[PDB]
A paper describes a structure:
The rixosome defined in Schizosaccharomyces pombe and humans performs diverse roles in pre‐ribosomal RNA processing and gene silencing. Here, we isolate and describe the conserved rixosome from Chaetomium thermophilum, which consists of two sub‐modules, the sphere‐like [name]‐Ipi3‐Ipi1 and the butterfly‐like Las1‐Grc3 complex, connected by a flexible linker. The [name] complex of the rixosome utilizes Sda1 as landing platform on nucleoplasmic pre‐60S particles to wedge between the [name] tip and L1‐stalk, thereby facilitating the 180° rotation of the immature 5S [name] towards its mature conformation. Upon rixosome positioning, the other sub‐module with Las1 endonuclease and Grc3 polynucleotide‐kinase can reach a strategic position at the pre‐60S foot to cleave and 5′ phosphorylate the nearby [name] pre‐rRNA.
The following two ct pre‐60S intermediates carry the [name] complex, where one state shows the 5S [name] in the pre‐rotation (2.9 Å resolution) and the other one in the post‐rotation position (2.9 Å resolution). In the pre‐5S rotation state Sda1 is flexible bound to the intersubunit space (ISS) of the particle between the L1 stalk and the tip of the [name]. Here, we observed contacts between the [name] complex and Rpf2‐Rrs1, as well as with the tip of the unrotated [name], to which one of each Ipi3 and [name] copies form a positive interaction patch. However, Rpf2‐Rrs1 as well as the connecting rRNA helices H80‐88 of the immature CP show no structural differences between the pre‐5S rotation states with and without engaged Sda1 and [name] complex. Notably, before the 5S [name] rotation the [name] complex is already in contact with the tip of the pre‐rotated [name]. The concerted movement then generates a steric clash between the L1 stalk and the tip of the 5S RNA, and thus initiates the overall 5S [name] relocation. When we superimpose the free rixosome density into the ct pre‐60S particle with 5S [name] in the pre‐rotation state, we notice that the Las1‐Gcr3 submodule becomes well positioned between the [name] complex and the foot structure, so that Las1 should be able to reach its C2 cleavage site within [name] that also flexibly protrudes from the pre‐60S foot (see also Lau et al, 2023). In agreement with this superimposition depicting Las1‐Grc3 adjacent to [name], we observe a density protruding from the [name] ball after filtering the [name] complex to 25 Å resolution.
Residue numbers in the entry:
A (entry chain LX): 12 to 52
B (entry chain Ce): 395 to 443
C (entry chain Ce): 85 to 107
D (entry chain CI): 184 to 335
E (entry chain CJ): 86 to 277, 362 to 423
F (entry chain CB): 18 to 40, 52 to 188, 204 to 308
G (entry chain CM): 51 to 79, 87 to 249
H (entry chain LG): 106 to 259
The structure:
Amino acid sequence: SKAAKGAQAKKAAQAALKGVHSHKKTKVRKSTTFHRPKTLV
Amino acid sequence: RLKPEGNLLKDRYRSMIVRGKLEARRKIPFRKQAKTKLTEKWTFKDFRI
Amino acid sequence: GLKADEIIAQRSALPAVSVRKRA
Amino acid sequence: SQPGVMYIARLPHGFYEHELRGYFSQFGEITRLRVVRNKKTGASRHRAFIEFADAEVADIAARTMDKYLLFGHILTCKIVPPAQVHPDLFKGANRRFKVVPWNKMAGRQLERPLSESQWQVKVAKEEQRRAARAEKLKEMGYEFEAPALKVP
Amino acid sequence: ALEKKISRALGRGDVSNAARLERNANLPEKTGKPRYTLNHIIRERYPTFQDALRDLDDCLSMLFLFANLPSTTAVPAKMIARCERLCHEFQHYLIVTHSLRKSFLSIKGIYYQANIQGEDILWLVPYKFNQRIVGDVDFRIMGTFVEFYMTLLGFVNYRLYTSIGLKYPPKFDQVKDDQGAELAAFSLEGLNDPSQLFANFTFFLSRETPRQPLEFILRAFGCKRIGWDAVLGEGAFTTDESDPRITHQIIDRP
Amino acid sequence: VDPDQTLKACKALLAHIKKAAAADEESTVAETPIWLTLTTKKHIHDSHRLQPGKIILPHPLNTSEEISVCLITADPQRFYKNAVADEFPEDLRAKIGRVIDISHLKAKFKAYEAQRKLFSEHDVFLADTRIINRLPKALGKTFYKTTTKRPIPVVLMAQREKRDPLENANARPIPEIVAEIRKAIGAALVHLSPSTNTAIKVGYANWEPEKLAANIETVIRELVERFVPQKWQNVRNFYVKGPETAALPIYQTDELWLDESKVVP
Amino acid sequence: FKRAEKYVKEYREQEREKIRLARIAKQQGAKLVFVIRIKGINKIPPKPRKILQLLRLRQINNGVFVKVTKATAEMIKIVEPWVAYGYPNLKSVRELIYKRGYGKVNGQRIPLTDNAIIEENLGKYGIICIEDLIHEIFTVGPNFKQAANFLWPFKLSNPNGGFRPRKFKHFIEGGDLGNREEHINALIRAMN
Amino acid sequence: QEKKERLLREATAIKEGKKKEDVSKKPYTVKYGLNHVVGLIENKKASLVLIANDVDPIELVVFLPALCRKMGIPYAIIKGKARLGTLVHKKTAAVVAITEVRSEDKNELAKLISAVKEGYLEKVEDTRKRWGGGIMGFKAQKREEKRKKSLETA
RNA sequence: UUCAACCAUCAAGCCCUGGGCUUGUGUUGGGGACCCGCGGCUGCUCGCGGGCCCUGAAAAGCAGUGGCGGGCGUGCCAGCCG
């Protein structure tokens, strides 16, 4: 398709101008409460 | 032409477990990975050409 | 002279602004 | 739909037909490409034309690699319009430009054997060459007695 | 914290700072020693040298087993070399004191029993072959045991050499060890009857014979002239088999 | 090759270039060099040789003091520069204007404009034989498309691991180095290429006819015996020419064939 | 995605290797060497990769024993950018065979846990034990080729894998081409 | 460390009776520090200026592109004050500048300056004068698109 | 998802004692006048190699010659020869 072919062109341009590290992991949180992390005492 | 029998490493490990310097545990070949979600960075989202 | 040296030394027509006389 | 032709220049040494095809195939499907090369030694003239199937993809690739600094070369990528893209641009495209040793052609042609009539006309022609050179030397104030070539 | 500083230096590209911070880490792969020093732990665990001699059975079996393994991430090659060197120093002490008493060839290995200061010391050494590391053992905690046991055996060797009045550590010839001297790479020097059973004989060990146990037993029971084949290693009294001074020859060929 | 015809050609072409320059006049006469053109019956070499051969002359070339001599040596350049400052005679000290090692040459003159500037800043380039194989890549086609200023091979090795340049330079004695440098600056250059035509320097316009003739005959002599393959039956024609004058024949052969086996009926 | 600089670098590496192989072929022209496969360029020319297949250096950190002949010297000179080779000593040969020695029987890898395996596999040649094998390998006997064919290539380790900030770094850095002579023994000690 | 051996070598030279210039050469380093770089730009000594994109407060560098444009200095905005700090052996550098490089890097500096001039300045010459921001939220854009679609349908 | 460096910073062979000789192929692309030698072209001219200048590592069709093998007769070879 023309839309997919254009999307391939944009993806190639993005990889050429910015690199291939396009994604980042985010933690899955089963709970809504944020707790203070436990550190060394 | 003597064929050695047994494993001396396993014998020493069994000796340690029997004498009680440590307890018998099994190998964990794969550990459970942290549950994460992959998302695209803001700069790569806002890239326009 | 060199073209590379001319490119490095290329500036504008504005005179340089000096805060004080330098030794 | 409409084909898109991109003219690329300032090509560094090593950035040739196969590299261009493999690189711009990531951008999109390439139908034709031709790197302008020298006739005498086979070396490139640091420019090429790539004809993509899609003009939008060609335009995107040109805007991506316009003024790209590659191996000390600031690459030039422009899109030629369909109005003045030349109809004779892509003969010799999509195939290897072989390197022919014209030096070795001259060597084997000069060392190959011939026929007796051919050396007779060679003796004759070299005699008229000597005669013309002697006529030119006559105004020079110089005289040279050239021995006549014996015929085989 | 030092490893975090090393990671920061490597991420910022300061290779000189990274190397300078890395030399303070005391890595086992570059020192041959444990990463963490257990000298204060040795005195706590063994109040008496008699208790050290009583745990020498486990220590010697452990280190003689890990003298012959390939290098791993837990136990590096330099650590294995230090194991072999400590075992060779202990064997040299047994040779010069004639403390070796009994030996046995079992289907599992070679059992050695010696007597040091009235304490019977029995340990097992594998035959020199390719030892198999299986997944049924905890090799990393075995390496921790190795670190503790070399830390013990170093002080045991130092005390024994000082008690017999010899300088410790012994002079070690890297060129001879490179050529394959094994026990012959050590030269013992002074500081500042079953023991003479093989004293008057001259032995020649063939290549198919177990060189390290034969040499250790003969030198501990009084033999002073032992030669062998050139491929068995440097340090032989003689190499040619046609030497007329040879009295006994050990062969195991059909 | 008769020398009377050679000297007659010498007066002829000298009179021609004088009457051509007469149409500063003395400066226009000066710095006009003389070319000896050899045509062979075969290509003189099977591939492009980029190391010029040296021919020793009784009357040396480049004797003028206005020339610039650039010397390329192995690492370090420090030993050779202190040698230039201390233990060469004053004429060679004034003639040598730049001493640069291979490392600094590759570091500073990778640019084509840098190579062309170095080409224009000097007249004659001498190069040590330990590094002359790496000089085509370092100097590019600027120094080797034209055979006028190709680096002349000189031997600076002390004639008998990785050598440390600061500790030792593998140095051969300096007065005989001076002799080698003057021999190289006096020797003429012959360039071997896959061609039936070669050109060798024999003299300048203001030089006198009998030393021109002596240079021509001796350059012909060692050129035929040493470097031209299959010698005289491969030699076809000899010409002497200026930059703007036509060929002046000296020796024209009777045969056009290298051997009788090529003659096939 | 692959970069244009990577394409240019690969083309220049291939043409430089082609020039080097042409120089070796136009230039043409009995000890024991230990050869260790290291990391080089990604694309390998067909003749060096066939020489690597014959020398069984397919994987990184594989070590083999080679008898120095004219043909073997030419092959090593060809595959110099992908190998590190030197003269092993008696201690290196002994430690490699005793610690990491594996045998090739029926196409499988079996460790040398006994002299018996050598006895049924090389006993027709007089090699009946591990020290006979060591003698043949070290002294380069008449049966060195069959001994090296029996011996599996040695899988050496990566000491940098023991230290976390440089866990991904290769132990042997490429660039020091040519024979390392006796300095291959330090690499054997560190990797064995 | 390198400064320590340099001072020790200069101390030995002045002990045996030579000037520090006799044993030490002219240095070529990356100029950094905001006041230093601003002075170099004003005196037209800097040949290339790199300005970090995330300087907080932004008033420290908000005038630097205009100053470089007035004084005819090639400038470029780059990502990472920490990235410049890795160059200048610091945690953070707001701006760095090249005044002079060595003779081995004349060509590389000139080519980098030309690449900057043709690939950054000419591309941002017209985008630098436009107003930024003004982006609506996700729900706001969805509501606005639905409203315009309803208006077009009705 | 490294645009680094890496040829010989000397070797081998001759003379046989003099320090000399041989080999080790290794070049960005164009433009402008202009003297030439040689090989085809009836000839003009076209090629080969030389000579004199200019240039940011500069660039806007004009693609040209006989084949071995390999791939599917061939505007295919990250394979070569003539």
